[PDB]
């Protein structure tokens, strides 16, 4: 009665925390996702860079599929970076989800300056001969800002191949975005 | 109730004068994974972009023999006259009675997996139905999509 | 209520230009054994498969004199104009007002046995009505089929 | 009061059992059917073999009329074999309703092996000059398996003429199938 | 004896009928006995005589009635009965059946042998034995559930099949006994 | 209904089984029906094929089992069963017996005909008749009193005797159905 | 202990499973142990053998079943499992995945490497190390929320990828263990 | 309460009586034995006649095995005749268990006179081509006379082959005797 | 009072689980045994293979010492594999405790097929220059099957040297078996 309740919420924090990243049998290599919030669903984006040079920076503005850009009032809870590696891979990548002011600036070599301030978390990923890296999944949160789908144009993902010019089929990227449900029909279609 | 109107737009390629056409009901794969879900009534719609001057004998049912091929053997299948047929020769908004028909399955409950066995069968009669003249629509009714509660892994 | 819609599909054979046709109402034998059952309203429907270009003067009533033969003596029977007639010269889904008429018998209660005495009478006017052009439908209403509780012996 | 009730159910078993097969005046030669269950109705199949050879085996998969194959979700309570003899008859037949795995095997001369295991009851029928055999009606039950009309494709009837090549008009066969009511209309037909 | 022995008495009375279905009782030692007519209804017989059909030939026959019966074509028909009484000189075989032919919707030529096959009605066989005369030669086809009348008795048709011989007209008689209500009584002053 | 109709209900239920021991019931019209397996136990079949022994020759055969069954040789055996299923071409005669041979204490050469004589076990005959196929071809030998197990099923031996013919291998199949407990269920993570 | 220690007991029992997710326990010191089958369901294995595909080649394979399982295609499937058991001579690498291919809507030619990219399913890697054998080689993909049956097991497809070598057929076996309900028990008298 | 008890004993008589001889599935050809009484056990005798002539009478005095003849005070409840047929058999036999006065008379052709009086039941057995005879088991009762094992010498079995001289291996006979338990040991053996 | 009791049993699970394998000071290199159950004792077997070839499979049926094989009714709780390494060791071994059907099959090269099904846990052991492997002790449980000492003949241990032909003195094996107490004497010996 409101005394074991606060103790139960303390221990449930430790169950999440002590199982942050360990090779659990439900997903033994790559770290598992967290559950979508009741309400919201997800929506993916596969972005393909052009063949940029060896060790070159890369800028990319976030667009969306056009069925999503209709309802530009619904909120965006969190967004996600998946970096799924296909087998032939020896390179390194850094991924970042910073806020570029929209069309206030370019993306030419000031991107390497944008890695320096650290206003956002930075996802590294590197090849090891010892084994594949277990943790390749960043979650950048947005629930405090109450942003919407209409503000998703403002953000920009920043990619950096370092030790190689990235071949277009050595490592795919993804930007998964969690927003509310696209509104359901039910009217008589004409 | 509990339904979000799944639209599939399937345009048929080019016909000659007095020739048939068949095409099977292939759906998006977010729907096909919901194979158990009960399927209510369905309808078709014929929306022409202008440059249109033609008329059609569109009718859809299950193709027998588990989807044997659908050219010139549906000529016997248009010879029965069991289900009604939509004939569009009006070319003005309102002169046509209706763009739509009915194929209810509430007692049948032929599911999403049974939509693999259905095939739109098309007859054309005039002008051989050149490019961009009509845009066929087929709208189905089937119990509401359960969304995943897990972000991609 | 209490009724399952008994459909009988009777296509008429080939006519000449300006000739009549008659055919009696024969039903499936699972229905004819239910002779006592009360019969409500009935209707006809004209569904053409395409290749169709014709028009008809379909009208059904009881043939008198206990089914005397039904060629060229129904020309006087189309000369009265008592019951309405369906004329199909539209050839598009919705341009026609209606494919259906009405012959209610709720006060008459002319039973299943009295369906032996009815005869579809057909007039054709254009194109002599060649093969597979129209598929006639006639749908009746009559108290619900009692199924047997005994497996075959 | 719940004491003669159990005695009444015991004696009613004996009324069925002691009248299993006797030439009752309601049906004096062939054994009578049992009543269809409240709910279910029946549906017949007359199967006609091709002219197979003298003493040859015979396989046949169960199909249905196409009006039945629509509602392939409704249950099948029991199925029945009638072997009605027409007058000119001197031969012998064996009928069996086994479960063949669907398209996992052929039906060529392993059918005589399928008579041997005895996983299903076997209906014999033979001519006698002493008189016509009184019992020519097998009931194979299916209420425990909760099978449907969609599983009726899986079964196969196995026929064996023994002492003769079967003429097509010396003995008819039937497969009567008891399933639920094909769903009633009541909508305004168009 | 208060609604608890009553249900036990109705169970045992079923067994008295059932265990005495066919046995050579002393009240009728060779042919199986009839059942009692229902209170109300009476009976009415028909002797039908086929023409000399060929050896092993099928035979169709529509049910007519005597004309005094065909007047009151509204009264119900409870059950009908087939008696096959054998006269002494007999060695042949017969099959009798009481099926529903759709009235004038079809003929009776050699599709009768197809009508034996479906089994929608019970089939009465009868055959000679040198071991003795067959004890059971009496079919009762019931009609109380359909609520048919005398006016529907035209629709039925009896189907006869001599098998091992061409039937001589005086080797075996047939009968169709029909149980319907009482033909209405007079009592008016006749003129 | 308080411990006085209970004993009367158990008496009448004996008569329902007994008076329906063998009669051509519509659920199985020719061969006698099986009895229900006990809650718990399941069954397991054996088809045995003799070599072509001579005309009227005896035959011995020890009971083996499939090797998946011989693992759990501690579980009990409730009853065992003989099915003799006839295929159509058949005119011969067979006798089947389920006696206890002492295991490897003796041979099976022509003392088998002496083993038919003592009658310590029931003997299933089966013979062809032109009058018709024999309705009863199913022996049940009980074992619930001895509390034997699957490990003792090696000790028994089935004894077959073709009499009027040398048995062709495809005129009549035999079976030995054995009712024992459930082979133990898995549920562990397989590796 | 009244609905207040009950919720605390369920919290700590989560930590006993979680803190013992993978550690070399003495009950199974090298390969991670299975979880217990649910009360009800049993298991059924499949050993799949690829043809000799090339070095670093993709591989597609549709899930079939043994034919005794494909009979009862109405019973549910709780979970399915991937075991990758290594035999000793092994230096290669494999990736195993249990994705949903739409049934006969597409081929399996080199779009399989695209199917690794979306990440709608967990991906089991396995690689040789000279430091030692990898302790975790057992994926469990769950299906209890979808209420799928045995009849839907045809729709799934396992995706294998040898990477650093052309896979010899006897360097590493694969398995697909499937947990579904009990195949229905007999108990009827066998004929 | 002592009113359904007498009704239960009436119906249990009918269960035995209506199942006197019918081919039950527990023993389908030869009629089954009855249960030994609590107490008593059984003891068998196989008797082998010499090759007597065609249609000849046969006398045989009842002896016992010598382990049984020790305790000649214990009672004899009932005795039994089994006539087990081996396959090659076409003959006929009559078996009878009469009381011959011990050494007061011979057994030469007055045995056929001993069949005539009918003071004991007579078991016939005959071959039929229609099938093997189902009933081949006589039980002669002795519980009223209170005889013992010492009086079993007085009885004599009477066999009559009729249609053939009996070959010694066409049909075996048996005399099964139900008496009390031969007394159990338990002393320290020396 | 029956509420801290269930919490105490939850935490005691975590004390075992979080101390599954760690280098505790009571046994710093090889993982410790678990306590024998009250009742049962243990019994060892050292098995010595012949010099099989390089990378060759190996089969071996479980026998026992003859003093144990007397009381073949007593139960077997669990059995154990110890793989004790002596110093000169660079090879690799796999050990498995599968159920071979007794004399139903050989052990020639189908043993490598028996590794594939995974019906039993598989103990690997490999040399590392980084250090000796800490976990070399499999426990296969048998308490659910209620097997006895008489069924220990049915099992077979499967050994596989992989990278070398095993010298007979580079690595010993053991099979420790936990069964009940061999029955105690106390009678006056003669």
Residue numbers in the entry:
A (entry chain B), D (entry chain B), H (entry chain B), I (entry chain B): 29 to 218
B (entry chain A), C (entry chain A): 66 to 218
E (entry chain C), F (entry chain C), G (entry chain C): 28 to 218
Manuscript text:
Here we demonstrate that VLPs derived from Cucumber Mosaic Virus can be engineered to incorporate an internally fused Tet-epitope. Vaccines based on the resultant VLPs (CMVTT) are stable, immunogenic, and elicit strong responses even under limiting conditions. CMVTT can easily be linked to any antigen of choice via chemical cross-linking. Cucumber mosaic virus is a widely distributed virus with no toxicity to humans reported to date.
In contrast, replacement of the first 12 N-terminal amino acids of CMV with the TT epitope resulted in well assembled VLPs with a size of approximately 30–40 nm in diameter, as shown by electron microscopy (EM) and dynamic light scattering (DLS), preserving the native T = 3 icosahedral structure. We next characterized the molecular structure of the newly generated CMVTT VLPs by cryoEM. High resolution images were captured and more than 6600 VLPs were picked for averaging, resulting in several 2D classes of VLPs; the best of these were used for 3D- classification. This allowed construction of a 9 Å model, followed by refinement to 4.2 Å, and fitting of the primary sequence into the structure. The structure of CMVTT appeared largely identical to the parent CMV particles (RMSD 1.8 Å), particularly at the surface. Specifically, the subunit arrangement of the asymmetric unit (chains A, B and C) was identical between the parent virus and the modified VLPs. The AA dimers were arranged at the 5-fold axis and the BC dimers around the 3-fold/ pseudo 6-fold axis. Upon closer inspection there were minor differences in the spatial location of the backbone polypeptide in the capsid interior, most likely due to the lack of native viral capsid–genome interactions in the recombinant VLPs. Instead, the modified VLP exhibited additional electron density displaying 3-fold symmetry within the interior cavity (orange color), indicative of novel ordered structures, most likely reflecting tightly bound internal RNA. Interestingly, their relative location and resemblance to tightly-associated RNA species would suggest they might contribute towards stabilizing of intra-subunit associations underlying the overall stability of the particles. A further intriguing aspect of the structure is the relatively large pore size, which may allow for the exchange of naturally bound RNA by other poly-anions or other cargo.
